[PDB]
Amino acid sequence: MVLSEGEWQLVLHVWAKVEADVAGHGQDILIRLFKSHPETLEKFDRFKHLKTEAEMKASEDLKKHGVTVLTALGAILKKKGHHEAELKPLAQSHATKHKIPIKYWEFISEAIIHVLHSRHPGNFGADAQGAMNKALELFRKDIAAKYKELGYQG
Ligand code: HEM
Secondary structure, three states: OOOOHHHHHHHHHHHHHHHHHHHHHHHHHHHHHHHHOHHHHHHOOOOOOOOOHHHHHHOHHHHHHHHHHHHHHHHHHOOOOOOHHHHHHHHHHHHHHOOOOOHHHHHHHHHHHHHHHHHOHHHOOHHHHHHHHHHHHHHHHHHHHHHHHHOOOO
16 A cells, blocks of 8 residues: 555654653553453553553553653654555564564554544544554554464464
8 A cells, every 4th residue: 555645744744742751652552452452461561461441541650661662653654555564574573572462563553543643633634543553554564464474373
């Protein structure tokens, strides 16, 4: 797939607001993911023990990881489709070190959109949301193709 420049512009406009508070958004997103789909929490040996939202909010380690997650994602979105090199080490660790099924990538995609919609309704209308969804689909399908090449696909 190919996004048009207009769709990229809606994606990076919203993303510019996210970057005003990278730590805050990464924590909201990860927490939303773990509440909505608790099974994903089990893949993180580091966070496995957190039992409540309050424990998650309080974890400095979790907020650090969220900053790490959104920074890697930001650098990919800013490539506007040209993200081959950024993608490979990411797919390799998640496929063969962390053992992450493809399905969980959709789950975090869902969380991202929920959070942007709650925090940026003015900059996250129907059109901007369709653009963000297209960008994350594009991303997921490229991750899925790399999984396959790496011998995982699952
Ligand atoms: C937008 C999607 C995501 C991005 C950009 C992302 C990025 C990263 C980065 C940059 C790291 C650290 C270096 C590495 O191991 O490659 C990491 C580690 C990790 N990721 Fe992801 N991640 C994403 C989605 C996921 C998903 C869907 C899961 C699990 C449901 C996941 C599980 C993990 C685990 C288990 C670690 C290691 C945590 C630790 O340090 O103990 N990631 N992620």
